[PDB]
Design a protein around this ligand. Structure first.
Ligand SMILES: O=C(O)c1ccc(-c2cc(=O)c3ccccc3o2)cc1
Ligand SMILES: [Zn+2]
Lengths: 47, 161
């Protein structure tokens, strides 16, 4: 695992081309996330 | 130490998690190549993940971050898709769940868009798709995502394509 930028605890990847995309985020320590919900699903074929 | 508690679909907690799942689907620039072609999901089950040790590990670290950032953990709920979700719920996130080749360096990646994390359920780029049918757009096989509590603290802002 890499280190976060000096002075920071994570990275935010802000989209700057695709206007409909939401943000993505990166952490560099496992202890900064807790897996709260497990969701079981299928993708649905469009009609 | 992990136990999984099923939520009832009548539970407002099930409903708010389902809504985050459904309302954050978008179209992807690969035309569905990685994650499949779909506009919504059939949600089959939602379970709360309970592990005391992993929770206390998280809150310990959250307090450290918070105290380094004017008492602000900057905590979010975000999606994570991985072939290793069974290991993650039992042993926690660690270095072995890093995206070594990710655009922001080797760390653990999370998405606001559920459909973005869905592209990783069978591996980077969707791998070879589902184990049973080798189909990245499989409509039959059951998929799993995590909806996770993530401490961002002071986040470095990368504008990017
Ligand atoms: O096993 C791996 O190498 C592995 C690599 C990446 C992910 C992953 C999982 C995600 O949910 C995700 C979200 C936004 C951007 C990238 C993302 O990547 C999950 C696993
Ligand atoms: Zn399949």
């Amino acid at each position: 695992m890499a280190h976060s930028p000096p002075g920071h605890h994570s990275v935010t990847g802000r989209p700057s081309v695709n206007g409909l995309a939401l943000a993505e985020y990166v952490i560099y320590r496992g202890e900064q996330a807790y897996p709260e919900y497990l969701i079981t699903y299928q993708i649905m074929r469009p009609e | 130490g992990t136990i999984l508690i099923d939520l009832s679909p009548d539970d407002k907690e099930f409903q708010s998690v389902e809504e985050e799942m459904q309302s954050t689907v978008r179209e992807h620039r690969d035309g569905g190549h990685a994650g499949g072609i779909f506009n919504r999901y059939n949600i089959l089950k939602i379970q709360k993940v309970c592990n005391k040790k992993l929770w206390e590990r998280y809150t310990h670290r959250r307090k450290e971050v918070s105290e380094e950032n004017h008492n602000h953990a900057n905590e979010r709920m975000l999606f994570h898709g991985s072939p290793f979700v069974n290991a993650i719920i039992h042993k926690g996130f660690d270095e072995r769940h890093a995206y070594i080749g990710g655009m922001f360096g080797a760390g653990i990646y999370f998405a606001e868009n559920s459909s973005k994390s869905n592209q990783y359920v069978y591996g980077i780029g969707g791998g070879t798709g589902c184990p049973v049918h080798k189909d990245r757009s499989c409509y039959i096989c059951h998929r799993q995502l995590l909806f996770c509590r993530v401490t961002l603290g002071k986040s470095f802002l990368q504008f990017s394509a």
